[PDB]
Amino acid sequence: DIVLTQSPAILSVSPGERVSFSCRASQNIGTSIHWYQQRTNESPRLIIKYASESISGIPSRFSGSGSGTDFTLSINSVESEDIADYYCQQSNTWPYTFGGGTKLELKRADAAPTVSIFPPSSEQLTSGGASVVCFLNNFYPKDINVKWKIDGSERQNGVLNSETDQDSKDSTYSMSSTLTLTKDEYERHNTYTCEATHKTSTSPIVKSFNRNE
Amino acid sequence: QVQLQQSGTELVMPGASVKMSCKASGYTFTDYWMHWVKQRPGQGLEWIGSIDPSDSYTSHNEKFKGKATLTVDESSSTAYMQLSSLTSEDSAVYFCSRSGYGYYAMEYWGQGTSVTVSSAKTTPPSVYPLAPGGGATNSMVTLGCLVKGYFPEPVTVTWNSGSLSGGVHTFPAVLQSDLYTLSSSVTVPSSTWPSETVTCNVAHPASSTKVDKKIVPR
Amino acid sequence: GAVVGGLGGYMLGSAMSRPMIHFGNDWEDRYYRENMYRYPNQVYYRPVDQYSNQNNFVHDCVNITIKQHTVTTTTKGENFTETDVKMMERVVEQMCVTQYQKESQAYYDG
Ligand SMILES: CN(C)CCCN1c2ccccc2Sc2ccccc21
């Protein structure tokens, strides 16, 4: 099969900037590459066909070049509406194949997360459950790591995480990390710590509480 | 103008099949190939297969031969894809698309059908208030609501009936056991809480659930 | 259908205008356009009443037409690749369906 490799996987861009990203095919496909834009929660949209041919209704700032194996999609001046995943696809021979995508991302100043930890509610404890929640809000870049500890000991079981998409206003990211235990298991320990590691600091942001307090 | 109309959602049991439709309009149906593309949550596009409506000649991604059956109904200008023996691996959005005339850029796309495969029954959420404990700082307090153990998606989380829109992060749902869980945080000035009321409103249409949880200290 | 020599029950349908066929990718569409003249423009079949239904008529019509086109092609020192046979199968299938409808219409007309 024709493998399509897109680079980079993620591209951080500043509004107005000219940006490019590449699609390379493992075999010669002439001009039989097509580019699609996919905004969050939307369908893909054709933006360039046959390497370089424009599509009606698509802003003229989009252009493509290349023939053979190496293909480039260029955006003359990147706008907020251009923030999306971009996929290439070849139609020269079966099977049709797609590149793994290039995600566009708005570049902003680095921001450390505001971290907040929450003990289990009494109403959850009444039902026998115990979820300790940690919010890591409004940080940049997207990459971040959360560790939980109970009485000093690390814990990864019963930890579920969830990440927001880049905020459209301030261009930051947020994450929630929830550690779920049983009431009895939760009663047998005192201290619970949410530990956030982010590139804005080599020091982890530690948020914790002690039950007996 | 050409349009490709697909059903929004399908909820389907593991091991069952689903047949999803793609109704075309605004052009001569038999003049253009139709294509089916899979997208797993947070993953890329995967070609499943394609069909020429003129004679129902098909081509498949090898992996989907035996899984995905492609047909059309010329009378109704509708393409169909039937997926069989569904598993959690088939939970995805499925797009149909149409190419050009003797050209194979996918010019028009349906809105996609989101398939969830699960044996879970409709379950209302347990909504837990997340209140801090005195040592909250910044001149700014973060409150939260844990929405746990519901099925299916979606839930709508608002704060104070939608009057609290700024400073809220409602995170995508995550599968915990075989039920969904999400949290919402709202960041608010220390004046306004607990002096004024902060309440999360969790609507779960599928179970006719509408829960208001006031965030109270301790 | 026209009968001659020793068709062993088979009949030759009248020549059909070659349709524009799209194969769903750039290479095959071009290949087909350039090579379509190498495939039959008429099909061989047994009388329609000798089959259970369309599918069985078509399946047979396709096999005999292609088999017999292949020996004549072989006699000329030419060969069909896997692509050729795939494409031939498709266009011959179309013609066999058309032939069935024509034949079954006549079968209904007394
Ligand atoms: C000149 N043609 C009438 C030959 C008959 C067509 N045909 C065929 C083709 C090539 C070799 C032998 C034969 S005999 C035959 C038998 C059934 C159907 C088609 C054909």
Task: Give your account of this protein's structure.
The complex is a heterotrimer of chains A (213), B (218) and C (110). Chain A has 213 residues and is mainly beta. Chain A has helices spanning 122-126, 183-187; strands spanning 4-7, 10-13, 19-25, 33-38, 45-49, 53-54, 62-65, 70-75, 85-90, 97-98, 102-106, 114-118, 129-139, 145-150, 153-155, 159-163, 173-182, 191-198, 201-210. Chain A folds into 2 domains: 1-108, Immunoglobulin-like (Sandwich); 109-211, Immunoglobulin-like. The longest helix of chain A has 5 residues, at 122-126. Chain A is elongated, with a radius of gyration of 23 Å. Chain A starts with a strand and ends with a strand. Chain B has 218 residues and is mainly beta. Chain B has 2 domains: 1-119, Sandwich (Immunoglobulin-like), CATH 2.60.40; 120-218, Immunoglobulins (Immunoglobulin-like). Chain B has no helices and 19 strands. In chain B, the strands form 4 sheets. In chain B, strands 2, 4, 5, 6, 9, 10 and 11 form a 7-stranded mixed sheet that branches. In chain B, strands 12, 13, 15, 16 and 17 form a 5-stranded antiparallel sheet that branches. A 4-stranded antiparallel sheet of chain B has the order 1-3-8-7, with no helix packed on it. In chain B, a hairpin with a 4-residue loop joins strand 18 and strand 19. Chain B starts with a strand and ends with a strand. Chain C has 110 residues and is mainly alpha-helical. Helices cover 54% and strands 4% of the residues of chain C. A two-stranded antiparallel ribbon of chain C has the order 1-2. Chain C is globular. Chain C starts with 10 loop residues before the first strand and ends with a helix. Classes of the chains: A mainly beta (213), B mainly beta (218), C mainly alpha (110). Chains in contact: A-B, A-C, B-C. Promazine is lined by residues 4-5, 7-8, 10, 44, 64, 68, 71-72 of chain C. The site of Promazine has 10 residues of chain C, from helix 2.
